[PDB]
Every structure is written in C-alpha cells, then in structure tokens.
Design a protein around this ligand. Structure first.
Ligand SMILES: [Ca+2]
Ligand SMILES: [Ca+2]
Ligand SMILES: [Ca+2]
Ligand SMILES: [Ca+2]
Lengths: 663, 663
C-alpha cells in the first residue's frame, strides 16, 4: 500500500530492494549513475519528479517534428513571378503556411521547453557524468544549432539553404529510446548490406553490358539502349520491374526470340538476387536483435544484483532466512502471492535441506526473482480515488464493482457493440439509397456513442486510472471514446451549418474503430489464432521501425523541397511534355513539404515510381537528379522494408512456438 | 573393379550387400517390391536395362511437353473471315504451326514411346503389384486418353474443346520424380493456405465497404467507386499496389485529407497482411519439407537394413568379425579407405572391447554405414576406355594423366579463361565503334573455341565419361562446348550468307557463358562466400519448384487460348478503345500458345498486370472473365512465388551454419 517512487526515495532497505526488483520486472531501467552512488535519495527524487512529466516532453517533441508541415518553403521566400497566394498555379495547398510572427512564437516556445528538458538531467546525473556522455553532447549540439537558427531568424526580421528541419528531425530521433535502438541495429547491419550492394551492382553492370552489346544494331538498340549509360539505367529500372513490358517491347516486335533473354534476366534478377538480399538482411537483423536482447537482459541482471547488494548490509554476500521472509513479505505486499504462515517458512526451510543456517547467495536470488516474476501476475495499484474510503467501500459501490469485475459485464458490452454494428450497417445502407429516414438511425448512433462514454467512465472508475491505462486495448478505447465525446459536444454546441460536423456521418467511422475489438474474438477459433495474435502483437512492436522509416522520409522530403522546390509550374513549358502531365500526376510534386511527403510515400510502394525519376530528370536537365531517387530506392526499399519483412517473420515464428509451448 | 549393376544382378552376397549400400548412399532407391522378393535376380536385371535408357524417356517427355507450342490453335480451325495465313492481322507468329500430317506423325511416334515406357515396368514389378498402385493407374488413364484422342483425330481426317493439351502436361508432371515430390508438398500446404485466404478475403470485403460508404457523395465516388461491385474490384487491385496513384487521384484532387485513408489501407494491407501470408506459407513449407526428408531417410534406412539381412544368412541378427572384414574389403574396393593389415583388424577387436565373439547387431550396422559414407569420399569408376590397358598405361599417357590431375593444369584453364575475356571485350568494343578491323579479332575469337573442345576431350579422357559426368560443373561445360563445335562447323561447311551463323556474333555469348566459371573464384574471399555458394546451390535445387510454376503456366495458357482465342483482331472495333491499344500491348495477346506463355509471364512479375484484366473484360463483355486472372494471381503469386521466397531463405540459412561448422 506504498507507492513505488515513494518507496525508492524513502523507506527501509527492504522497501528499496522490493521497489528495485519491481522496476526491473516492469522493464523500466534507472540510470546507471544513480545506482552507482550511495543511497541515491535526492537524485532519485529529482529523477522521479522529472519522469512524471513524460507526456509533456513527448508532446513537445511531436509538436517540434510536425512544425515542418506548416513552415513556408524556402523557394517561396525568393521572389516568384506569380505570388504564392495563387495556390492553384503551383499545384499545392490544403495546409496553412505559418507567417513570420507565428513561426517565431512557435519556435521560441518549443525551444524553451526543449532547453529545459535537455538541461534538466544535469541535476541528478552530476556535472562530470553528464558532459562525458556522447548522447548529451550531441543533443546539446542540436539544441544550440536550433537556438542560433532562431536567433538569426529573429535578427533577420544571406542563406543558401536552411538547416533547421534536419536538426529537429535528428533531435526527435534522439528523443525516443526505440528510435535509438533501431539506429544501433542499422549501424550493425550496414557493413553486410554494403557487401551485398557491391555484388548486386556488379551483377547489374555485367547484365547491362551484355544487353547493350546484344542489341547494338537492333532497332530496339536505337530506340532505348542508345548508349551504355542509358542501357544501364533501363536495366536497373527493369530490375525494379516497375516497367517490364515497356522497356523491351521494340525488341519483341522486331523478333520474338529476344524475349527469352529478358525472361532470363528478370527471372534471375527477381527470384534469385532479391530473395538473397532479403535473406541476408534477415540474418543480419536476427543477429543484431539477439545482441540487443542480451544487452537488455544483462542490464536487468546488473541492477537486480545491485538491489541484492543493497539489502545485504553486511556486504559479505550473505542472506539469512529472516531477511528472505521479510523481503517475501514486502513483495507479497506489492505482488500477489500465496499467504505464508509464520511456522510455514520454517517448515519449508527445514524440509528443503538438512543444512543449518543455509546462505542464499546472489545468483540464485536473482534467478528466483525472475522465476517469481514470471510465474506470478502483477498486482494492481490499489486506487487513486480511494482517498475517500467510505464512498469506495459503500454497499452500492461494492455491488457495482463486483458486477463490473464479473465477465457478465464484458458479455453485455459485446452484445451492445454487436447491436451497434447492426445499426451502423442499417444506417449506411439507408444512406446508399438516399432514403429520408436517416435521422432516427443517426440519433440512435449518437446515443450508442453516449453508452460507450458511460461504460468507459464506469470501467475507469472501478479499475483505477493506472490499472485502466496499463492494458493496451484500454488506451485505444479511451482515445476513441474521448474523440467521440469531443466531436459530439462540438456538434451539439453549435447549431449551424458547419463544414464537417453538421453532416454527422463522421461518427460512424469512430464506432467502426470502437468495434475493431470484434476481431479479438477470432482468437477463440483454433484456425485463426496465430494470425490474429501475431497481428495484434505486431502493431505496437512494429511502431518503432515504421517511425524510423517515417523520419527517413522526412529527411528526404526536406532535401527534395530544398532542391526541386519550384520546378513544377502551371506555366512551365517543359513540364507538359513530361510523363507527369500525361498521367496527370501534377498534384504529387515537391513544391511544398506535405506534397513531398505524399510523393515520397508513392515512391515507397514502388508503384509507377520511375515516372517521377524520368520527369524530374527532364525537368532539371541534369542526370545527377536521378541520384536522389536512386538513393531513396537503395537505402529504403532494399534495406528498411526487407528489415520490416524480417521482423514480421520473426514475430510470427515467436507467436507460433509460444502457442505450441502453451499446449 | 566390378560394375555396380553387374554386382547386384550377379555375385556373392558380399557383392550384393556392398552394391546395395552403395546405391543407398548414392541416393538412388530401388523399388520396394524388388527388395521384398528373394534374391531379385531377373527383376533387377530388367530394372537396370530399363533405367539405362533414362535419357530416351526424358527426351520423349520433353518432346511431348513442347508439342503444344507448334500445335495449331483451335479457333483457327473454325472458319475465320480472313485466313490465318495472314499472320500480321491477328498479332501472332514466329513459330511454324504444325500441319495435320506432321502432327499425326509426331503424336504417333511420341505415343508409341510413351506407351512402351509406361508398360515396361510390369515386367519386374509383377501383375498384382503394378495394377494396385494409384500412380500406375493414373498414368495408364492419361495414356489411354491420349491414345483415344489420337485415334479419333486420325478418323476425323464435333468437339467443343480439345482435351489433349491438359493431359500431356499432367503426364509430364508425374513422369519426373522431382515434380511428383513438389505436388505432395502442395497438397499438405493447401489446408493451411485456405484458412488465411478466408481472413484475407474478409479484410478485402470490410475495407471495400468502408471506402464505398466514405466516398458515396464524393466526386471520386462517381468516377470509380460507382457501386460496391466496382469498389471491391478496385480495392483488390490496389492491394497489389499495381495502380497506387491512379485509383485514388480524383479523391486527392478534391481533398488532400483523403490520402490518409489510402495511405492507411496500403500500409496495413501490404506491410502487415501480405507479409503475414509469406510467414504462413514459409511455415507450412518448412513443416512439409521435414516430412519429405524424414520419409526419404526412412527409405534409405530400410534398404540398408535389407543388406544386413542379406549377408546374415543365419537370419538371427548376428554378424561376426570375420564376416565384417570380408564386407569391409568389398566397400574399400568401391570407396577409398585406409589399407588394413590382416593382423591389424584382429588387434582392432581386442583393444576395442574385452568381450569375446562380440555380435554386431542390426541397428549399429546402419548408423556406422553413414559414418563411413560422409567421412570418406567416393572412389571414381576406373574407366570406360581402359579396355586397352597398354594405351591406358603407356609412358606418354601416364605423364599426361599426371599433369591434368595436378592443379597446375587447372590454373592454366583459368589463365586461358581470363585471356579469352579480354579478347571478347576488345572485339565487342570495335563493333560499337564500327571499326573495319573487327574481323581479325573475330577469327582469333573462334580459335578460343577450338581450345575449349581440346581441353574438354583432354579432361574426359583422363577421368572417364562417368566420372566426368558426375560433377555438376562439368556437365554445364560439356553442353556449352558442344554447341560451340556444332555451331562452328555449320559456318565453315556453308560459305553462304546465312541469316544467323554468317554474322559470327553468336560465339561471344557462348564464350561469355563459358567464362562464368570465374565467378566461382569469388568464393575464396570471406565476404562473398555465403552469397555465391548459396546462389550456385540454388540453380539445381530450385529447378523442381520453378518447373512446377512453368507447368502451371502451361495449363492456364491452354485455358486462355481456348477461351480468348480470337478476341484480339486488327479489325476489332472495341479493341482500340481498350487499354491494350493505348499502351501498344497487342503483341501480348492470347491468340496462340507461344504468345500465351509470354503474356502469362508478364502477369507473373505483377508489372502492369491489370491492363490485361481490364482490357479482356471489355473485350469479352462478361465480368466472369476476371475469374481467370484473379484465380491466377491467388494460386500463383500468393502461394507458389511465396514458396520460392520461402525456399531461398531456407537454403541460405543452411549455408551459413554450414560455414560455421567447419571452423
Ligand atoms: Ca550478510
Ligand atoms: Ca451520404
Ligand atoms: Ca548370423
Ligand atoms: Ca554489330
């Protein structure tokens, strides 16, 4: 009945040892310097009061990252012949560009929060330890670069280019631990990836030389393979298989037999080389993941053994039975454990061995700690609202709590949400037929949303906020119901013809999200257990790699906006001759940052990706431009996406043999 | 110095046991019935005289399979408005269509060889055993269907469709042992694969319904998502991302926020669901592969213990030391083994154990036979040309044989291989510049061909044809050098302006194929050892799986020609409005069998694959036409191609841990 942070900062050595093994099994790792020092009181107090505010730091980081969307592009600052206010001319829009004053205010606020966050942990780590670490130094470098940029911007109201987006993306990377771990893995994998890249490039060069020398006099040689550079470029694009029949169709028209060579190339290029690259990336990722897991387990073992050293006041590596029973009492005060009688532990010791005054040493204590952690479930925090026990223990409150804890409440929720799904289907079907009876079904939809809000409040009351927040699905349901109630009150408060809220259709999608929980019932059937379990495990586990890919996209988008900022115009004569106009892709240009993000995503799926390369190569006039696009394929598609595939396979196998071991 | 087949058919029990263990280790498995019967003399003689002619049966099988290419399409037999001789009108050609008399002659010859092959093994297997097996019955059914078809064709010179092309493909599947094993794998894998398709199809139905209801009144709803049937058709194509920006661009023009839904669907559809399908197919393949390997090893164990039963005339499960040494002398005649002294094996027994008259039991004879097999390399067949020992052991011949066996000769070939490459690159570069001095380099390029024949005859002479043919690498060089001399003698004999041979540019591609042996030297360096060794092993190992895909193409090609035979015409008005004409894809139609194979390959790589579905749906006029293309994608792309990706990953890992093992 004692909070963990308070137990660490204040209490008897038994309390501190119990809370340390608590933090270990929860997975949270204290800084090493705090462990090294003696009794770590004030430093732990500061560290806890700091980590209590993690939400504010995360929101600041996300705001700083998403500033890039609203920031005005550089090429617009240089005088364009039409003003940028003519939004249709440059094929862009749908986001408001921040003016100078708004930008400076936003940057100043974010910079202040970032500064206080970055210079907070000097308090407990200490002057000497803080400055020695590389991470603190690189973060301070990023912060000072941002600050000097803000200052010179303020004084401004010449630069070839601006450096803020790259540095803020980098500091966002260094902000989150998972992204740092992902970068460590990538740095591990780079050498082997480079070796495979060298082999692949050699294969492309050889195949391109063969294809060039084969069709030297053929009409298809005049049409496309005009030079060695051109044929190498076409062979690379064909290796991506984005345009299979297009490249070699004049050869097929001239003579059918030539097709054999091409069906000989792609077959080798796709089924052999690409799969070998995938296997290599899989192996490297597996080794690096094993390395990371071993490191994490080593850190956990180290800080558990530090806790054992803490409880051992004699520091002679000796633990007695009385100390063991006191520690067991502390943990069973925290965690759920079978009740122990005073004579019972003595009887257990006596029947255990005939040795007298047996010493429990360090390593078996650690191992027994992991055993008791894995065998026994965690015990919920008592409450946050229990400051008034009389209301907490009221008869009606007790009856309600007993009812909601019973599975009958879950069955009722399932029935309610199934009826909700039926109502949503009926309303949508009526909408399709343009019936005039939509309103009763829509108000039924709203009252269903109100029911969801009510049940969320009931559950968060009965379980307690921390225990409610602990479960993953509860967080998703919490966000969904909160956005539902916010939207509903926004619609109700204003009885006017709003653009979005007045329609009232939006609510259905939220309820559909609220009913994604249906898919969880499919874990019941044996056939689909592995698929659903692996998918649900994958989502939060695969968030960090997707975030790394997203940040790489952000960096490439900044580079592309900087380089190709103003090339696409309504009045550009060379543009209409390019393939973008023919396929009507003008809305996917690089004129502003959000458009850059969407076009980079389109390049990511490898769907008609060569049209952008060819069009921008014609538009800029230099072959070097393709470098950019080529780089995006080499770094992202060959490496990161193959890493994601490897992770999905590994997660599926882990779920599978876990299910087998369950039997 | 006794041939293995002769040893089995005639000889003492020691000879038969040695030859049986040799066959078991070599991997060749005798029929079970021959093992069951006593002493299996005449049956083994017939089986050997049969299996001696495996090349003829294989060539007959391949000729029967490739008959389909030259066979006239059915739709041409129906009277067309313009004659089929107008080859340009129907967008087809480049192969000669086999006339009636030629077709009947070819079919009769192939049928005769097939019939004698299929009815040969009744001789040794016996009447009751042969007819009971399912495989013999299905083969006989295929044969009788083919024969009755040939007979009714002969009598003809009404039918809605012809059944021959499907049958001769099936009889090709179960003629080859490797292709039979692959189908057994797919039968096991189909049960698990069907479960996932239910979830994948369910995900498509749900996602399509959301997209349909979201964009009901949107301008993008009018253009593409006009109905639920249409939106399900578009979302399915988007799942493969073959047309990513095309489908949802009217929505992006209306409101940029619409991209978020299409980004979400593609992200979850491609990165999560598609990879999970690969994980499921990988597992099912891995489990079934162990089922096949364990079954194969069980068959090897059974025949090995049969050899022990054969030598054990007492049939009491007893083997004595004096009996063991006689058998050991037989294997050391077949396999290389250290020389054993007569007194030595007596010393071996006493030091081994103090037991007297120790019995070597049935089981420990088996595992010991593998122990000798893996540690000791195979001993080559003495020779086939050694019928004249005086020439074989002549003074000059022995000196020559010593030189070629020595590694010094091997270096010279590699040195010659390099000098050839410089001659080729110099000769080709002159052609690029249209130099008039190409001929002097071209004739010097021929003489490198005669060297390659000279060393081929030199190598086959010292090793012997059976020992020469044993190595996989030697087989590749043997085929390459033979087409060189066959091609070269064609140009020399005819001093005329031939279409292909007179140019002389053909030899460089054969020479480039000959020096592919150089890439094997990259196995020396540690960085590329894993990549190259896996790739080389993949070429023979992946043939049965690639062969299975090719045969699936032959079945769809026959179906496509039957259904879509005459739809593509020069005079067809609806065709020019379709997407095929806009992209100029008319040469990839389904008019005849050779064209069908190429266009099916284009669907295999998933490159602009939707143009064929959409065009033929308009051309035929029924929505049932998409069934042919959707079924092809589901069976081939999702299952077969993922199986190949599963195999390449599996083959690579067994290569890495192999390399670790020698260390
Ligand atoms: Ca002590
Ligand atoms: Ca509507
Ligand atoms: Ca015996
Ligand atoms: Ca030429």
């Amino acid at each position: 009945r004692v909070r963990r942070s308070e137990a660490i900062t204040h209490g008897t050595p038994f309390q501190k040892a119990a809370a340390l093994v608590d933090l270990a099994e929860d997975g949270i790792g204290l800084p090493v310097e705090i462990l090294d020092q003696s009794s770590f009181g004030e430093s732990a107090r500061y560290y806890f009061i700091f980590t209590r505010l993690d939400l504010i730091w995360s929101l600041n980081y996300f705001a700083l990252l998403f500033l890039n969307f609203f920031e005005q592009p550089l090429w617009c600052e240089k005088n364009p012949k039409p003003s940028c206010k003519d939004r249709d001319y440059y094929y862009l829009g749908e986001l408001p560009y921040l003016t100078n004053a708004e930008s400076i205010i936003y940057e100043v606020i974010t910079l202040a929060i970032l500064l206080v966050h970055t210079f907070f942990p000097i308090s407990y780590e200490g002057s000497r330890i803080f400055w020695t670490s590389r991470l603190n130094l690189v973060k301070v470098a990023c912060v000072v670069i941002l600050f000097v940029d803000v200052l010179v911007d303020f004084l401004y109201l010449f630069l070839p280019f601006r450096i803020a987006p790259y540095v803020r993306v980098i500091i966002f990377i260094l902000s989150i631990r998972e992204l740092r771990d992902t970068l460590v893995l990538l740095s591990g994998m780079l050498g082997t990836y480079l070796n495979i890249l060298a082999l692949w490039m050699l294969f492309l060069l050889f195949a391109s030389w063969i294809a060039f020398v084969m069709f030297e006099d053929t009409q298809q040689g005049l049409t496309v393979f005009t030079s060695y550079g051109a044929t190498l470029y076409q062979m690379f694009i064909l290796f991506t298989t984005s345009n299979n029949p297009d490249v070699w169709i004049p050869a097929y028209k001239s003579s059918r037999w030539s097709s054999v060579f091409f069906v000989l190339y792609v077959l080798i290029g796709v089924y052999f080389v690409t799969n070998l690259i995938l296997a290599v990336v899989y192996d490297s990722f597996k080794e690096q993941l094993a390395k990371q897991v071993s490191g994490m387990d080593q850190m956990k073992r180290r800080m558990l053994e530090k806790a054992f050293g803490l409880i051992d006041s004699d520091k002679n590596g000796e633990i007695d039975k009385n100390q063991c029973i006191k520690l067991f009492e502390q943990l069973t005060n925290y965690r759920t454990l079978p009740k122990i009688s005073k004579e019972e532990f003595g009887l257990i010791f006596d029947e255990l061995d005939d040795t007298r005054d047996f010493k429990i040493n360090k390593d078996e204590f650690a191992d027994l700690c992991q055993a008791i952690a894995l065998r026994f479930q965690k015990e919920e925090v008592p409450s946050l609202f229990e400051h008034f026990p009389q209301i907490y223990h009221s008869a009606l409150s007790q009856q309600l709590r007993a009812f909601v804890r019973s599975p009958n409440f879950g069955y009722a929720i399932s029935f309610i949400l199934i009826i909700n799904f039926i109502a949503v289907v009926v309303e949508t079907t009526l909408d399709i037929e343009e019936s005039s009876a939509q309103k009763p079904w829509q108000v039924a939809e709203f009252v269903f949303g109100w029911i969801y809000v009510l049940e969320m409040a009931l559950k968060i009351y009965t379980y307690g906020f921390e225990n409610y927040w602990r479960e993953g699905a509860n967080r998703f349901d919490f966000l969904v119901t909160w956005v539902i109630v916010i939207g509903e009150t926004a619609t109700f408060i204003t009885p006017d013809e709003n653009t979005f809220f007045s329609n009232g259709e939006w609510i259905r999608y939220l309820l559909l999200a609220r009913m994604l929980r249906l898919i969880r019932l499919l874990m019941n059937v044996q056939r689909y257990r592995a698929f659903i379990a692996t998918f649900i495990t994958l989502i939060p586990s695969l968030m960090p790699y997707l975030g790394t890919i997203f940040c790489v996209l952000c960096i490439y988008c900044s580079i592309g906006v900087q380089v190709f900022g103003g090339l696409v115009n309504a009045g550009n004569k060379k543009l209409f001759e390019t393939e973008l106009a023919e396929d009507d892709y003008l809305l996917f240009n690089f004129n502003d940052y959000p458009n850059g993000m969407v076009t980079l995503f389109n390049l990511l799926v490898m769907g008609n990706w060569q049209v952008w390369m060819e069009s921008y190569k014609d538009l800029t006039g230099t072959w070097w431009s393709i470098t950019y696009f080529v780089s995006f394929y080499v770094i992202t598609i060959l490496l990161l996406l193959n890493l994601v595939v490897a992770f999905v396979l590994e997660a599926f196998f882990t779920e599978l043999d876990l299910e087998e071991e369950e039997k």
